[PDB]
Amino acid sequence: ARARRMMDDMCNIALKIGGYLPGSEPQFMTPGLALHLAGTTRCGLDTQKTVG
Amino acid sequence: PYDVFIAGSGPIGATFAKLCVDANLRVCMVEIGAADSFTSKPMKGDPNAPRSVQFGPGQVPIPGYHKKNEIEYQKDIDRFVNVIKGALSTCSIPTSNNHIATLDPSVVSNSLDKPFISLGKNPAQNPFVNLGAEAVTRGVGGMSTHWTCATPEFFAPADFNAPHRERPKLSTDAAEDARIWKDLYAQAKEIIGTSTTEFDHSIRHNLVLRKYNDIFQKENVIREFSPLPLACHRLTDPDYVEWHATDRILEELFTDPVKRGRFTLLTNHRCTKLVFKHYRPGEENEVDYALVEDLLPHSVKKIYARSYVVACGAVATAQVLANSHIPPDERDATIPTPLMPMLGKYITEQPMTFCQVVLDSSLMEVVRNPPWPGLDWWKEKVARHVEAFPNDPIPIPFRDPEPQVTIKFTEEHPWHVQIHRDAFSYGAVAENMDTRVIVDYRFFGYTEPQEANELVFQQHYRDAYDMPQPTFKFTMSQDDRARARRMMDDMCNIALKIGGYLPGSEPQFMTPGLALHLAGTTRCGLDTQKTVGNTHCKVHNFNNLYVGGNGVIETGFAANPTLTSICYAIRASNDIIAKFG
Amino acid sequence: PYDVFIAGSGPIGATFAKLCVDANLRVCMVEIGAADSFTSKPMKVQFGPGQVPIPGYHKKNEIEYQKDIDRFVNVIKGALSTCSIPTSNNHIATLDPSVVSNSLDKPFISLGKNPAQNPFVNLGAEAVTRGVGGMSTHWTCATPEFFAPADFNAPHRERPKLSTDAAEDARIWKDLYAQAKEIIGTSTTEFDHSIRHNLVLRKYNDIFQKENVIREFSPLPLACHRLTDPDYVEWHATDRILEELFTDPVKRGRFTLLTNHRCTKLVFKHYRPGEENEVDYALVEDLLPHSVKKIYARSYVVACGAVATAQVLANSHIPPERDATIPTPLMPMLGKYITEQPMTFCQVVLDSSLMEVVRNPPWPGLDWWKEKVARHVEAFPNDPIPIPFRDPEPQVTIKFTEEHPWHVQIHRDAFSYGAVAENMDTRVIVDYRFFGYTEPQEANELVFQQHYRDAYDMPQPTFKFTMSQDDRARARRMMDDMCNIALKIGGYLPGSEPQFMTPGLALHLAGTTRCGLDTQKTVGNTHCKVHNFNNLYVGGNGVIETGFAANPTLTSICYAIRASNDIIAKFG
Amino acid sequence: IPTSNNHIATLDPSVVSNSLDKPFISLGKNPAQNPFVNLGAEAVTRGVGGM
Numbered sequence A: 001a002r003a004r005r006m007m008d009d010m011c012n013i014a015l016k017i018g019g020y021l022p023g024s025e026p027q028f029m030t031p032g033l034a035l036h037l038a039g040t041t042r043c044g045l046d047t048q049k050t051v052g
Numbered sequence B: 001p002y003d004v005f006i007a008g009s010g011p012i013g014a015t016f017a018k019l020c021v022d023a024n025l026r027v028c029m030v031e032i033g034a035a036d037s038f039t040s041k042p043m044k045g046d047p048n049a050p051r052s053v054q055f056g057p058g059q060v061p062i063p064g065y066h067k068k069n070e071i072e073y074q075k076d077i078d079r080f081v082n083v084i085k086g087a088l089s090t091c092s093i094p095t096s097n098n099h100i101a102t103l104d105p106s107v108v109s110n111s112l113d114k115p116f117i118s119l120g121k122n123p124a125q126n127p128f129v130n131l132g133a134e135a136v137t138r139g140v141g142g143m144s145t146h147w148t149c150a151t152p153e154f155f156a157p158a159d160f161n162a163p164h165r166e167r168p169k170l171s172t173d174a175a176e177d178a179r180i181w182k183d184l185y186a187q188a189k190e191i192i193g194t195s196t197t198e199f200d201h202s203i204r205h206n207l208v209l210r211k212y213n214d215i216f217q218k219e220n221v222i223r224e225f226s227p228l229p230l231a232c233h234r235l236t237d238p239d240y241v242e243w244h245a246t247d248r249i250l251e252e253l254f255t256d257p258v259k260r261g262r263f264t265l266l267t268n269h270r271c272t273k274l275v276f277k278h279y280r281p282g283e284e285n286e287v288d289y290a291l292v293e294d295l296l297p298h299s300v301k302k303i304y305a306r307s308y309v310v311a312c313g314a315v316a317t318a319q320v321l322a323n324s325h326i327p328p329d330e331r332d333a334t335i336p337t338p339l340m341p342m343l344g345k346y347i348t349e350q351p352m353t354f355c356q357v358v359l360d361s362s363l364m365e366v367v368r369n370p371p372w373p374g375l376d377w378w379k380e381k382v383a384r385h386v387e388a389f390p391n392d393p394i395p396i397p398f399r400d401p402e403p404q405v406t407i408k409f410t411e412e413h414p415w416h417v418q419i420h421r422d423a424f425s426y427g428a429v430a431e432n433m434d435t436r437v438i439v440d441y442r443f444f445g446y447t448e449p450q451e452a453n454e455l456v457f458q459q460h461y462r463d464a465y466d467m468p469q470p471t472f473k474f475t476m477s478q479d480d481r482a483r484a485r486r487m488m489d490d491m492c493n494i495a496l497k498i499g500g501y502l503p504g505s506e507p508q509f510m511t512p513g514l515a516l517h518l519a520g521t522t523r524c525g526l527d528t529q530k531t532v533g534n535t536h537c538k539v540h541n542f543n544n545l546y547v548g549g550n551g552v553i554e555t556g557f558a559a560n561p562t563l564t565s566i567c568y569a570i571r572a573s574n575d576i577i578a579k580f581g
Numbered sequence C: 001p002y003d004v005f006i007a008g009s010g011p012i013g014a015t016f017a018k019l020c021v022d023a024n025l026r027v028c029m030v031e032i033g034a035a036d037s038f039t040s041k042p043m044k045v046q047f048g049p050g051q052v053p054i055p056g057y058h059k060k061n062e063i064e065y066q067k068d069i070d071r072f073v074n075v076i077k078g079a080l081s082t083c084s085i086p087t088s089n090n091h092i093a094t095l096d097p098s099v100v101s102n103s104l105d106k107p108f109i110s111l112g113k114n115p116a117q118n119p120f121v122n123l124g125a126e127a128v129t130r131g132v133g134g135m136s137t138h139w140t141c142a143t144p145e146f147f148a149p150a151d152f153n154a155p156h157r158e159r160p161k162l163s164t165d166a167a168e169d170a171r172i173w174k175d176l177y178a179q180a181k182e183i184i185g186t187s188t189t190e191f192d193h194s195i196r197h198n199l200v201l202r203k204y205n206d207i208f209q210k211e212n213v214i215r216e217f218s219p220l221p222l223a224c225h226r227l228t229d230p231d232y233v234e235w236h237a238t239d240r241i242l243e244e245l246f247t248d249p250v251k252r253g254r255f256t257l258l259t260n261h262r263c264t265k266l267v268f269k270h271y272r273p274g275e276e277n278e279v280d281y282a283l284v285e286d287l288l289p290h291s292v293k294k295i296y297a298r299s300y301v302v303a304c305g306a307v308a309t310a311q312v313l314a315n316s317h318i319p320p321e322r323d324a325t326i327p328t329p330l331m332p333m334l335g336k337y338i339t340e341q342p343m344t345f346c347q348v349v350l351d352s353s354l355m356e357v358v359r360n361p362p363w364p365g366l367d368w369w370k371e372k373v374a375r376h377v378e379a380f381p382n383d384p385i386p387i388p389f390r391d392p393e394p395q396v397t398i399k400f401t402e403e404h405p406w407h408v409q410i411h412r413d414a415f416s417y418g419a420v421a422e423n424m425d426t427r428v429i430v431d432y433r434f435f436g437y438t439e440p441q442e443a444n445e446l447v448f449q450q451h452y453r454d455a456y457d458m459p460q461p462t463f464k465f466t467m468s469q470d471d472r473a474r475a476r477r478m479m480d481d482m483c484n485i486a487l488k489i490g491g492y493l494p495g496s497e498p499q500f501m502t503p504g505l506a507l508h509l510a511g512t513t514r515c516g517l518d519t520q521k522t523v524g525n526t527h528c529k530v531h532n533f534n535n536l537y538v539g540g541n542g543v544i545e546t547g548f549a550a551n552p553t554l555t556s557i558c559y560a561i562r563a564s565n566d567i568i569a570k571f572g
Numbered sequence D: 001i002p003t004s005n006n007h008i009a010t011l012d013p014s015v016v017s018n019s020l021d022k023p024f025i026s027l028g029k030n031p032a033q034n035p036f037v038n039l040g041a042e043a044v045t046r047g048v049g050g051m
């Protein structure tokens, strides 16, 4: 639900100062492209749900 | 002489023919293209008619039938895109001299100062002010053999002196203007067969229409969604629709032997030009004859009539009339048209944005359990499908018709919205998706009429039919641009309420001219100094010369023009009947 | 009862109709598609009173397509319905995360796909056209004969045997091919005043006369005629075959053509394999809205093309687990030994040195050429290409031989040029299409699904096709031959470098209802009568039992003649 | 990178090919990966200073 709203937000924002360049129209990217994977050795206060 | 000569056999030329032959006039129609799409109807009075099968004895073929009516295309709808592409001839293709660096070094090549000279290109066209996708269809029925059949009315504001209107003025009195339009639209809708109810039992249509109205009732600005008026009727087998075309306009001129004897249709015959009484600008004049050439070998003919109608579409009507400025017997020079000085000036065409979406997964639950009353037909169809295909993730039945939804133009959101499906050619990523959950969006804007926007015709370059090469000089205004941006924004906002963009069909502008709604090339109206013809589409200074088609329309409009152009063809035909009957 | 019932209105069905009506037989022909392409001719101005409309006219005859030939590719694509498209379940990684999607365990169930087709043994580009005239409303009209070797016991031949006697076989084929050529209007002269055609043909002959292995180039035989206005060609189609059945009211009175009518199946006297049988009636359905008819005739002909002929006959095995096919024990060789042609393709741009040939041809006496070049050069002095603007394409072939056993066409087909390629002028492009053959093998088959159906509710076709080792060896040689030949006169156009095409693209599928002398390995005899049925005949490329490389229509017309004559003898 | 067994319909018929029964076994693919629950663009950089 947030992903859809994000996409809607981007279209609204971008169009305030320009128009989409052909080939680079609004689109989702392949999952993982951000390279911001996290939580694989997750650390925090809840000992039973964390690695550290 | 014939009573009426008509160049062009699209739905406008056919309306003139129908009305004039129904008023007992004798009509000669010429069409540059072939008869290439047919249905079959019983000939009236033939004793074999009751028994008859299509195209068998007792029946007559009727040209100008919609090509999408063939069952193959009702079953495999995305194949129709190829038919449309096959039917469109691009008006103006500019030259280029690009280097191909990986040619084998022994082969013929272009160079910097020997470019190719290639058949089919227009050396005078500046690519930057072109309508590069503006195209024509030559054939009996014109573009009506493939059109999508949308027939909206044009918007008329509550204030008659509002700064913009889509519907042109036919009178300077607001009440009479309204009267006239209500009569013409009623008759145009009857001629073409407009309906807003032929998708009333589609799940997809009702899903989209009702959901959008529910969503937009809850927003700060209210927007109304309605069925798109379409010239079609769904058949007694509801899996099939008959899309309407020129065939229904011409029908009785073929089936009725009395009407047939007053109608002549010459196919593969080009109207090259009209020949006038004299060539002096500003003075009363008359057409003396039409110069027509038979393009098939078996040929130049003078056709005499009392009145002449040029209904060759927006490019070609102007083309014929430009060519007519060269009486019979600088490389980039164009043909001056001092007899019709506003010809090809104030041209308009619609900017267009497009996208497709995949419907939200959440809407599939609405399909399984819809909240609106009066939908037992929907529930039953769904239950049948779910029990026949219990592993199908999509609960929409397999042959459910597509949606056919519009938002009518308003001054507050001054563009025309279609939410539907057209045939489309899926790429390698997008053809992995099921057709049932795709919805297309096409938003059309308007452009202001400006004298400097023009269609002109080359003296020294010719098209494939030996007619003067068209050249476009088209640039949108700052206000046109601003609306076009708002339009794109609106399309993104609306599309994303019910689905997410399909890869390869994300929000984009299309090539200028792709709408094919070019107008104002022979513009008709009350302002005599800025128009080619009057509100009856009679050309100024010519007592017996009429024009038809989208070219007569003098406003900047965003909605599909065909219905309004039929109104003008009515109005012009009635003038011809009164003067020449 | 009619005398003859015919399912299908392609050029084969039309040949049976014409010959049977000419012999005073009453014919009912049914065609699943629409009449959608017409000309008009006078009864014994086009589309007025006095003229009669004739369906099955070639779509390319419309002037629009003679003036803009590359547009005609859209017409062909619009006409072809792919036979068997396998299912797939590809992940689309960039869908918006809220939209309907396939998953590993819940794939889409999509109209128009064949879950039973293994893609690795498919003919993925095999397709059909449904309409009056079948594929003849868009075909390229090439009508060569098939190769018959000097030795009647050669291990391969293209032309099937119609007798076990060599001389008699030769006599029969000589008569059939002459009559076939007249029916369809074959000519080899319609490009003889093209500069491009003559440059290609004469250059290649000059080149290959100087090589130690001689190869002969000749004009491609085409069912067409150039009109009196030589910018135009009338491409022939089923209209020419049916013409008299429409224009002569006596003949019109013996011929009924029902369009949008599916031959769903034939119903037989009984369903016991191996015993003499007959067709009782055809089950036909009117698909147009305004129901099911039994149509009775003395004889029945299924001429529905290679796939759909076998499809009707398979469906007829049903009197009126998921992947199970329809068993066909009444016709046990139905769909077995199927053949299709591997094809290689490229395009070249002509060598720059050939333009000086165009300017000053070295062959004497070509006044027509020099005059056209002179007019061009005077009107367009800065054109670097001296070939005239509306100069017709080349239409050149090398006839199949056993030493180079493929069929070569050197010509221009309608083509959609990419972003690199359409910067090149069309006058200097030449296309190469090389077609090979595949040996008939029992395991290569077309079968029909019990529980899957096509868009017209017929049993879904499924292909199982794998080429042999010798077929592959020949195909590599064919590719090498194409590279060698093409590079003599030009260089590969970027984007159209030498490549194999998708199997089935040739649309020369054969052997699905194979006819011949070996009763045990055939569906029908050399008169195309189905074994054990006294009144059932088949027509089309599916009857051809050999592995052939050349274009099959002319040869199928020969078989339609021969079958028609058997029908006329027996049921006249 | 998940495995796949796509048919290449235009390969020269004499060449090495995959089949329905005998897919390629190709270095660098993960036979365990379901493509529909993948992070197909997740990637690493090996070098001093990492990414």
Ligand SMILES: *Cc1cc2c(cc1C)Nc1c([nH]c(=O)[nH]c1=O)N2C[C@H](O)[C@H](O)[C@H](O)COP(=O)(O)OP(=O)(O)OC[C@H]1O[C@@H](n2cnc3c(N)ncnc32)[C@H](O)[C@@H]1O
Pocket: B007, B008, B009, B010, B011, B012, B013, B030, B031, B032, B033, B084, B137, B138, B139, B140, B141, B142, B143, B144, B146, B147, B148, B149, B150, B151, B269, B270, B271, B272, B311, B312, B313, B314, B316, B317, B320, B467, B516, B548, B549, B550, B560, B561, B562, B563, B565
């Ligand atoms: C191609 C197309 C068109 C439309 C839609 C979609 C597509 C892909 N969708 C559509 C449109 N219009 C609407 O209002 N609603 C929609 O959903 N389409 C446009 C519509 O199709 C046109 O507005 C309409 O046909 C215009 O009718 P017309 O004014 O009669 O003009 P046509 O172009 O149809 O026919 C002209 C006719 O004249 C012939 N001609 C041209 N030159 C000559 C000469 N010199 N001599 C004789 N005849 C000539 C043409 O060949 C043509 O047949």
Ligand SMILES: *Cc1cc2c(cc1C)Nc1c([nH]c(=O)[nH]c1=O)N2C[C@H](O)[C@H](O)[C@H](O)COP(=O)(O)OP(=O)(O)OC[C@H]1O[C@@H](n2cnc3c(N)ncnc32)[C@H](O)[C@@H]1O
Pocket: C007, C008, C009, C010, C011, C012, C013, C014, C030, C031, C032, C033, C076, C129, C130, C131, C132, C133, C134, C135, C136, C138, C139, C140, C141, C142, C143, C261, C262, C263, C264, C303, C304, C305, C306, C308, C309, C312, C507, C539, C540, C541, C551, C552, C553, C554, C556
């Ligand atoms: C599409 C195509 C075809 C060929 C060439 C190029 C292209 C792009 N070029 C060509 C070919 N052949 C040659 O010899 N030389 C060339 O240059 N083409 C193939 C050629 O077009 C065919 O070989 C020829 O038509 C075969 O004729 P036919 O045996 O009469 O078969 P058709 O497929 O033409 O017509 C069959 C007909 O039957 C109807 N049908 C199918 N099922 C039914 C059922 N159940 N009921 C009733 N009718 C049925 C089809 O609709 C079709 O009309």
Ligand SMILES: [Mg+2]
Pocket: B189, B190, B193
């Ligand atoms: Mg009505």
